[PDB]
Design an enzyme around this catalytic site. Structure first.
Site, PDB file in Angstrom:
ATOM      1  CG  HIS B 506     100.804 -14.799  52.836  1.00 60.38           C
ATOM      2  ND1 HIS B 506      99.439 -14.729  52.945  1.00 60.38           N
ATOM      3  CD2 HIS B 506     101.271 -13.491  53.034  1.00 60.38           C
ATOM      4  CE1 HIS B 506      99.035 -13.444  53.034  1.00 60.38           C
ATOM      5  NE2 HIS B 506     100.131 -12.671  53.147  1.00 60.38           N
ATOM      6  CG  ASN B 551      97.088 -11.387  55.716  1.00 63.76           C
ATOM      7  OD1 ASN B 551      96.048 -11.580  56.298  1.00 63.76           O
ATOM      8  ND2 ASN B 551      97.162 -10.696  54.598  1.00 63.76           N
TER       9      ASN B 551
HETATM   10  C1  FDA Z   1     105.547  -7.486  49.608  1.00 64.07           C
HETATM   11  C2  FDA Z   1     104.244  -7.755  50.311  1.00 64.07           C
HETATM   12  C3  FDA Z   1     104.304  -8.363  51.565  1.00 64.07           C
HETATM   13  C4  FDA Z   1     103.209  -8.469  52.382  1.00 64.07           C
HETATM   14  C5  FDA Z   1     102.031  -7.901  51.921  1.00 64.07           C
HETATM   15  C6  FDA Z   1     101.882  -7.488  50.600  1.00 64.07           C
HETATM   16  C7  FDA Z   1     103.054  -7.211  49.849  1.00 64.07           C
HETATM   17  C8  FDA Z   1     102.852  -6.957  48.411  1.00 64.07           C
HETATM   18  N1  FDA Z   1     100.899  -7.888  52.717  1.00 64.07           N
HETATM   19  C9  FDA Z   1     100.973  -8.402  53.955  1.00 64.07           C
HETATM   20  C10 FDA Z   1     102.006  -9.200  54.336  1.00 64.07           C
HETATM   21  N2  FDA Z   1     102.019  -9.889  55.481  1.00 64.07           N
HETATM   22  C11 FDA Z   1     100.993  -9.782  56.324  1.00 64.07           C
HETATM   23  O1  FDA Z   1     100.954 -10.393  57.381  1.00 64.07           O
HETATM   24  N3  FDA Z   1      99.940  -9.076  55.956  1.00 64.07           N
HETATM   25  C12 FDA Z   1      99.895  -8.196  54.908  1.00 64.07           C
HETATM   26  O2  FDA Z   1      98.854  -7.617  54.630  1.00 64.07           O
HETATM   27  N4  FDA Z   1     103.152  -9.210  53.560  1.00 64.07           N
HETATM   28  C13 FDA Z   1     104.179 -10.087  54.043  1.00 64.07           C
HETATM   29  C14 FDA Z   1     105.129  -9.442  55.063  1.00 64.07           C
HETATM   30  O3  FDA Z   1     105.614  -8.210  54.546  1.00 64.07           O
HETATM   31  C15 FDA Z   1     106.187 -10.379  55.558  1.00 64.07           C
HETATM   32  O4  FDA Z   1     105.601 -11.523  56.127  1.00 64.07           O
HETATM   33  C16 FDA Z   1     107.035  -9.754  56.698  1.00 64.07           C
HETATM   34  O5  FDA Z   1     107.620  -8.507  56.232  1.00 64.07           O
HETATM   35  C17 FDA Z   1     108.135 -10.757  57.070  1.00 64.07           C
HETATM   36  O6  FDA Z   1     108.959 -10.167  58.086  1.00 64.07           O
HETATM   37  P1  FDA Z   1     110.402 -10.640  58.375  1.00 64.07           P
HETATM   38  O7  FDA Z   1     110.543 -12.095  58.778  1.00 64.07           O
HETATM   39  O8  FDA Z   1     110.945  -9.657  59.235  1.00 64.07           O
HETATM   40  O9  FDA Z   1     111.100 -10.601  56.945  1.00 64.07           O
HETATM   41  P2  FDA Z   1     111.343  -9.452  55.845  1.00 64.07           P
HETATM   42  O10 FDA Z   1     111.488 -10.162  54.557  1.00 64.07           O
HETATM   43  O11 FDA Z   1     110.355  -8.347  55.987  1.00 64.07           O
HETATM   44  O12 FDA Z   1     112.734  -8.850  56.302  1.00 64.07           O
HETATM   45  C18 FDA Z   1     113.935  -9.621  56.257  1.00 64.07           C
HETATM   46  C19 FDA Z   1     115.110  -8.737  56.009  1.00 64.07           C
HETATM   47  O13 FDA Z   1     116.245  -9.471  56.045  1.00 64.07           O
HETATM   48  C20 FDA Z   1     117.111  -8.953  55.070  1.00 64.07           C
HETATM   49  N5  FDA Z   1     118.110  -9.922  54.667  1.00 64.07           N
HETATM   50  C21 FDA Z   1     117.779 -10.857  53.861  1.00 64.07           C
HETATM   51  N6  FDA Z   1     118.835 -11.718  53.738  1.00 64.07           N
HETATM   52  C22 FDA Z   1     119.873 -11.157  54.509  1.00 64.07           C
HETATM   53  C23 FDA Z   1     121.227 -11.511  54.706  1.00 64.07           C
HETATM   54  N7  FDA Z   1     121.822 -12.586  54.268  1.00 64.07           N
HETATM   55  N8  FDA Z   1     121.914 -10.706  55.547  1.00 64.07           N
HETATM   56  C24 FDA Z   1     121.417  -9.617  56.077  1.00 64.07           C
HETATM   57  N9  FDA Z   1     120.112  -9.266  55.921  1.00 64.07           N
HETATM   58  C25 FDA Z   1     119.398 -10.028  55.100  1.00 64.07           C
HETATM   59  C26 FDA Z   1     116.294  -8.187  54.071  1.00 64.07           C
HETATM   60  O14 FDA Z   1     116.988  -7.193  53.358  1.00 64.07           O
HETATM   61  C27 FDA Z   1     115.076  -7.784  54.860  1.00 64.07           C
HETATM   62  O15 FDA Z   1     115.027  -6.437  55.059  1.00 64.07           O
HETATM   63  O1  GAF Z   2      99.210  -9.938  46.229  1.00 65.23           O
HETATM   64  C1  GAF Z   2      99.995 -10.434  47.313  1.00 65.23           C
HETATM   65  C2  GAF Z   2      99.483  -9.733  48.558  1.00 65.23           C
HETATM   66  O2  GAF Z   2      98.054  -9.637  48.473  1.00 65.23           O
HETATM   67  C3  GAF Z   2      97.442  -8.927  49.579  1.00 65.23           C
HETATM   68  O3  GAF Z   2      97.869  -7.562  49.625  1.00 65.23           O
HETATM   69  C4  GAF Z   2      97.756  -9.538  50.941  1.00 65.23           C
HETATM   70  F1  GAF Z   2      97.377  -8.779  52.063  1.00 65.23           F
HETATM   71  C5  GAF Z   2      99.263  -9.704  51.065  1.00 65.23           C
HETATM   72  O4  GAF Z   2      99.401 -10.318  52.371  1.00 65.23           O
HETATM   73  C6  GAF Z   2      99.898 -10.415  49.878  1.00 65.23           C
HETATM   74  O5  GAF Z   2      99.439 -11.780  49.871  1.00 65.23           O
END
Ligand code: FDA
Ligand code: GAF
Ligand code: FDA
Ligand code: FDA
Ligand code: GAF
Lengths: 576, 576, 90, 90
Positions: B506, B551
């Protein structure tokens, strides 16, 4: 979805896909059903390890494998937890909990046996080792003519190797691979032969391998399409195939009963030809649910009506495992052609070699890699380049060492991986034993208990046979101890051990092949046709009736190729 | 691939996809690049837990999560292994091995921080909890007018909830869920409120939930297509975005530099508008590689030229965790309306209730489920049906309990899962603390060390702040102990504990938002525009500048919606 | 040589362990990063718990220990007493 | 002197232990020395080791010795899970 197809195939693993490749190609209208779903990217059924990210982080792929191995039969748990708070709900018995199978004796199981329900089956995660079986491990296709039998297998294996793109030189430019390979060759000089594991794979760059899979065999795209405008294929994922319907003669199958998992609806599908390639476990499940063999706990006083050998004579391989840490002698040998002057980290430091010098132990390509690593990373104490690929070494099964071997670094690690010891020093050792087929070793299905898809629950009754199977297994462990020591000591935490029965996932003989149903105790003939049935064929490692140690998939594919010859010679494709 | 687009988006996670949904919809020619590849099935970027198999085997999904969390910064290992054989190559120092980061102090890390490089980002595996932040956790969008600020957030959050299909009743028919929910309501009567966790999800059946993801927000299909014949979108997976190019004025971006990972070629891409949604870590990496902030170990005597707050004031939440085993009182309450006659297993056994009886504690639907389970499974000692869904309970953050909570059963388990205790009895507890932003808490990138994609290696310098952050974290642990006890005792092996810093994922405030760059110590304005730049926008949780416990993703999406308003008002789409 | 230890010989390991006091324990460098934020937390791996800052952990006899009781180690030893052949013997 | 939590699962009558003990070449550079600053529990100069098994025969023999235990122990039965072949702490 149509009413009627020329051929229906149950399962989209590499064996299903052999049938599709051959029959779609020969112009049949083909439907293929899989209980699992497309989840490999746009190449349907492809290897999940073919992403740039997994090949940059290969230590993470074990998690992909584990997330699609669903245990076959879990006995009732009897672990005592007596530190619950007094307020918590506490059992008085060890009752049937958490999807355990109350039919399973925990002491006669294949606890490590698991299944994979995704489009492409297990070939979306597998190691891609594809050895041929030598005569000793291999069922006969020709009686009373060994050279003719040999010739037939060579024909079929050659084709299978093309479908899988088997090769033996994708790792030729690895220092570690050659280090190991050459040391073993020299130590067993005139006793054993070493070579690269045959691998279904094509190298795309020094750091990327396109591992083969079901997709390689057949791309699983619906046809007709632009590339194949006169072919007819539909793949239906998320469909559970439950039963084939026998006619009253027990001479033909009349339909396949299916459960569409998204709609919940049940249908039937009509085809001229039915092919079951659901895996060694689930082929047998579908058959038993269809009135073949015997449902329920075996009852020798109630003989089955059809295919009485089904589910008996099962084999699974013993597997021993360790890792080692490369010897100091071996590491120092990597850099034996280098002249070193000065102290690493200094301006005067120099590592040099002569490109062609008669007295050089290694090729120039090798000495260039080593010189460059040593000069460009003078803080690193090892002469092996960082991105050097892993060894992929075998000595194949022979009468004098009746086990297959795979020496290198398998993605399917069995413990939390080590971070402490440099990964370049680590070599894995897997030795695979052959298991005598015995009638009493069984896979059977409960008449009361059901699995996650509401099908009869699978139950094992298995022990490694006494006699040669057991003597060999323990000689095999000793052999791994002896051989691995030539390369380095064991890695603490990966000491020599037998793995959980069935973890190896080389189960055979659950619907075994032979010439004669009664004399050979078998279910299918050498065309893979179920005895008595005109239009029912089984594909897969369940067909293999012998004690084998090498990885079975290429063998199973070779049998499916031969099955498809029969189909093409005996059934006419509908008009387009 | 074209030369020139209206808008380029870096990353395909749910925040990238908010930008695509809004801008593709408004008629812009959009390109989106992701470093990762399509590997979720035919619905691109969708949730990996939406297969029939994972919802029948949900205990296996932890392995999918683990296989795509790649640690951000691993310190040099110093574990002593002194049981190597004398012949094995043995280190004299703890040298930089196995991709560790020699810049990272192991005692000031977020060791559990990880990244996910696949199309759809982390939303292909996430829990789907999407709470709003209350005022206390939330950055201002309007100064000096709380009701106006409230109204704006409500507008934006309402939209974000529609894009994610957030709902609060998908688990209303779960016995376990209601059991927990009602007990907590009664125990904290007039002190705290409990409700279902808001979840981005749609229930499809009693046993299947369509969990939301990036795909839900925007389906990621290339356009134009049949469904959207006047829209223009291309997604380019397996492309690493390395640098945005500043003009000499530092008033506009002029190109995006990219590395196509399949061909190995490097290109540049021209757009009117550049949007970085690469994640809280990788946005900051790309920016630092582009001349924003400071590259290398922080040096306060060498002030950065641009965005001096970039990478500072980072926040990550403290996370405490345990599981419990449902109390005997609670279990017996499930069946308090049943009249039981006879002995389970017998022909006379009878479990009955009256459908409407004024004195019934539960609704008829509940008593029907319980009666049926008890009569149909008379060998089972529990009154809870086998397929009963898990609780999904929260009491949201309030001044008097300044943490978010999630009570139920999360797929992302943290140890080998228990088989011994019945899964129906188990409830998980996660409490999430808020972290004060502090200048000294940093994410920075090495000027020497590089990661797996040849980019500056990320390094953390983080400790939970003294003062309120730490006092609250420990009060939060106590609170979980106190509250969880109302439901049952701890589960041995899942005792109350803090989780590894950053496991929670987070992370916020790495490119934080504010009204004024200097006074608010920030990188982007309330339209998410990078100060001084006409056409560069950041999206994601790195934008959030406050101490929050809930979250963050729904908050980040709401900010991206507002950003897209600005873009639509300030840039004209090219003609079709 | 008590009736109880020879009826419960599985327990004697505990007697041995309770009088083997390690000779030289290097400075510990295990990372514990799940402490509560309120707990006192080290900034370095400082000399703690009787460790020996002179000892290189990679050139130790970590398992070396001493026994300080009347009768020394012979109060717990296995009692194997082979002769050395010429090859092993001064 | 068992080296792990003892097994209860397998009948004790079936269990046999194997310990093989190697000889170590004396080498000048392998030292026990005592700190001039650090003291032990009895206020005496702290013992410090500087030891590695010698290269050459000592190390070749040690690893041949492990192999020998693998080979010989196999004549009596398979390894006991949890007591797999291993070098013990120096
Ligand atoms: C892994 C995880 C994450 C979350 C939960 C639990 C688990 C185990 N539960 C959860 C979360 N958030 C919530 O609000 N509530 C929940 O119950 N998790 C967090 C959540 O998953 C993230 O906050 C969210 O995806 C963030 O979104 P985003 O800002 O769009 O970012 P991502 O990391 O999803 O996607 C970024 C994207 O960019 C790519 N990438 C990375 N670097 C580059 C470069 N240089 N070039 C091109 N593309 C790049 C990645 O591959 C990725 O796909
Ligand atoms: O264990 C990490 C995760 O725990 C839970 O699933 C939460 F929902 C996620 O947002 C993340 O913090
Ligand atoms: C998991 C694993 C497997 C192998 C290796 C390592 C790992 C960890 N390594 C390996 C293997 N084999 C080799 O020869 N060499 C290697 O190096 N592995 C084994 C190999 O992976 C299997 O032998 C091979 O896939 C078997 O092919 P198959 O006969 O086609 O069977 P699959 O299990 O792959 O596919 C069957 C398929 O059917 C579906 N199914 C199951 N039941 C049904 C029902 N009732 N209806 C419809 N469809 C069904 C499955 O979902 C599956 O996809
Ligand atoms: C602990 C152990 C030891 C042995 C075996 C197994 C176990 C787990 N098995 C074994 C041994 N040796 C064999 O030949 N075969 C076996 O099967 N073990 C080793 C053996 O136990 C020792 O070699 C033997 O006791 C050595 O005898 P020693 O030279 O008399 O030395 P001790 O350590 O027994 O006694 C010394 C004695 O001196 C005291 N002490 C120490 N420092 C001081 C100071 N400064 N002042 C006064 N006194 C001091 C100790 O307290 C001790 O009692
Ligand atoms: O660990 C089980 C696996 O080990 C190795 O990868 C083998 F190649 C596979 O065939 C399978 O037996």
């Amino acid at each position: 979805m149509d009413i009627k197809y020329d051929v229906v195939i149950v399962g989209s693993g590499p064996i299903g896909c052999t049938y599709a490749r051959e029959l779609v190609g020969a112009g049949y209208k083909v439907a293929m059903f899989d209980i699992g779903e497309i989840d490999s990217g746009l190449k349907i059924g492809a290897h999940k390890k073919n992403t740039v990210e997994y090949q940059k982080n290969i230590d993470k792929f074990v998690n992909v494998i584990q997330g699609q191995l669903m245990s076959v039969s879990v006995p009732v748990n009897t672990l005592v937890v007596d530190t619950l708070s007094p307020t918590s709900w506490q059992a008085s018995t060890f009752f049937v909990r958490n999807g355990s199978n109350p039919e399973q004796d925990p002491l006669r199981n294949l606890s490590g046996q698991a299944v994979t329900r995704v489009v492409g089956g297990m070939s979306t995660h597998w190691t891609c080792a594809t050895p041929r079986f030598d005569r000793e491990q291999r069922p006969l296709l020709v009686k009373d003519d060994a050279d003719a039998d040999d010739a037939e297998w060579d024909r079929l294996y050659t084709k299978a190797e093309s479908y899988f793109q088997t090769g033996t030189d994708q790792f030729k430019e690895s220092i570690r691979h050659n280090l190991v390979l050459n040391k073993l060759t020299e130590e067993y000089k005139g006793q054993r032969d070493f070579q690269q594991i045959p691998l279904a794979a094509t190298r795309r760059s020094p750091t990327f391998v396109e591992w083969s899979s079901a997709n390689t065999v057949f791309d699983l795209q619906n046809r007709p399409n632009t590339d194949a405008p006169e072919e007819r294929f539909n793949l239906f994922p998320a469909v559970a195939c439950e039963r084939v319907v026998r006619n009253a003669l027990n001479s033909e199958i009349e339909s396949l009963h299916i459960h569409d998992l998204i709609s919940g609806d049940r249908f039937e599908i009509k085809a001229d030809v039915y092919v079951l390639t659901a895996g060694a476990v689930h082929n047998t499940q579908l058959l038993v649910n269809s009135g073949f063999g015997q449902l329920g706990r075996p009852n020798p006083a109630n003989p089955p009506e059809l295919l009485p050998s089904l589910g008996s004579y099962i084999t699974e391989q013993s597997l021993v495992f360790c890792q080692t840490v490369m010897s100091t002698e071996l590491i120092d040998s990597v850099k034996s052609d280098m002249t070193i002057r000065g102290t690493p980290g200094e301006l005067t430091y120099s590592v040099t070699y002569t490109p062609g010098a008669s007295t050089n132990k290694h090729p120039d390509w090798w000495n260039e890699k080593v010189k460059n690593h040593m000069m460009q990373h003078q803080e690193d104490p090892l002469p092996i380049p960082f991105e050097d690929p892993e060894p992929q070494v075998t000595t194949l099964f022979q009468p004098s060492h009746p086990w297959h071997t795979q020496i290198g670094r398998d993605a399917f690690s069995y413990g939390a991986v080590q971070q402490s010891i440099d990964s370049r020093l680590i070599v894995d050792w897997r030795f695979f034993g052959r298991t005598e087929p015995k009638e009493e070793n069984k896979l059977w299905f409960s008449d009361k208990i059901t699995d996650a898809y509401n099908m009869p629950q699978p139950t094992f009754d298995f022990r490694f046979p006494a006699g040669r199977t057991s003597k060999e297994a323990e000689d095999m462990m000793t052999d791994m101890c002896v051989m691995s020591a030539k390369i380095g000591g064991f890695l603490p935490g990966s000491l020599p051990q037998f793995m959980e029965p069935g973890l190896v996932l080389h189960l055979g003989g659950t619907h075994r092949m032979g010439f004669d149903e009664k004399e050979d105790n078998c279910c299918v003939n050498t065309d893979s046709r179920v005895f008595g049935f005109k239009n029912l064929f089984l594909g897969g490692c369940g067909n293999i009736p012998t004690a084998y140690g090498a990885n079975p998939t290429l063998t199973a594919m070779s049998l499916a190729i031969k099955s498809c010859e029969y189909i093409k010679q005996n059934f006419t494709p509908s008009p387009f």
